[PDB]
Amino acid sequence: NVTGLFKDCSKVITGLHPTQAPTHLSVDTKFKTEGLCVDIPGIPKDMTYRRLISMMGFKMNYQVNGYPNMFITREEAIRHVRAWIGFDVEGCHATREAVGTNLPLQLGFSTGVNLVAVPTGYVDTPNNTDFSRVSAKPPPGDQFKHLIPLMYKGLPWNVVRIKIVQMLSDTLKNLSDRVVFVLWAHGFELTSMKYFVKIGPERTCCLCDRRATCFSTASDTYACWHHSIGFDYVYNPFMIDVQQWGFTGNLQSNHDLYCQVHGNAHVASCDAIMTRCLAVHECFVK
């Protein structure tokens, strides 16, 4: 059966050649027979194309020795409360040369900050995958009127991930040796993390013996929250999903069960605050 991860979001009816397709499912039907594929010299391989590949549907259930889990139990989250950062992402929609996947528009945090990124995605070409800006539009509903202006307001992803690393470092430097991203219905937040998170075995900061907590692509090096200066990638974060603790309604509905001081000007940071707020109430009351 199928999965939505890496869904081909092009509008082309056809594609792909046996040599250019990443997977058997994405071969054009002309080349399929007897459950296999066949080379047909007279059909040229497409040496121009740009196919948007969906990053929705990631699953982080790997179990490899040396590599730590991103998703952690509530108790592990309890022990690292000071590392908690609520995180929400409002998104936009692929719309011109593609349709059927969502792209990060505005990322928000428990720290009141909100950042907004240019709509960019992962586009397959005849030679490689091209990380690039792509056409997009706001979610249709009248409830999403406030992201109309955000479409114009920023910001290249190489800049966005510089600012994310700097904001968490300046927040977490004197509080913990890690992040715990506090999510609510985590799928799209996990998709955004592809844009600014690397993972591997545990590492130590060059310049330190402290746990490595950021990564730099300028040179393949690692750092702690204090020495992550100019770094662009968050390395081996941790995260929890409040919704997986049993909650019927939506985020605001379930938060307002405990707390009545967090109103909601519908900003991404406002959701991330209610996400962290509701996790504290659930975890430590009674």
């Binding site: 969906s54 179990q63 059927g100």
Partner: protein
């Protein structure tokens, strides 16, 4: 909307490798942990009376090997991530790739681990005969 490209049996390994710093090392370490190699590749119905050389423009093969679509055997094409070439282009995409039938279980791992003779064009070890 759209067209699904992949099958759930590959979700965990591709997600693991799509986030790695060193994707090739992640995949090796993943197998070493008892993980299942990447499936859903493009296997070719072919005559199996070909030259047997590693990377060709049309399917080659002997009865001792199987022919795949090159991109479907590239971990970087498979996970849609950067290639470690300075220009950043695939060696395999746009070509057919033959793989020893004994290793046809794990084509992506095979291309990660092996290398081709520039003199004679066959896989070093399966089998290049120039010294």
């Amino acid at each position: 909307a759209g067209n699904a490209t992949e099958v759930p049996a590959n979700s965990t390994v591709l997600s693991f490798c799509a986030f790695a710093v060193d994707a090739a090392k992640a995949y090796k370490d993943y197998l070493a942990s008892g993980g299942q190699p990447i499936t859903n590749c493009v296997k070719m119905l072919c005559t199996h009376t070909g030259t047997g050389q590693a990377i060709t423009v049309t399917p080659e093969a002997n009865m001792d090997q199987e022919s795949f679509g090159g991109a479907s055997c590239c971990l970087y094409c498979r996970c849609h991530i950067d290639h470690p070439n300075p220009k950043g282009f695939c060696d395999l995409k746009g070509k057919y790739v033959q793989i020893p039938t004994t290793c046809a279980n794990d084509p992506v791992g095979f291309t990660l681990k092996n290398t081709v003779c520039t003199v004679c064009g066959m896989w070093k070890g399966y089998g290049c005969s120039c010294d």
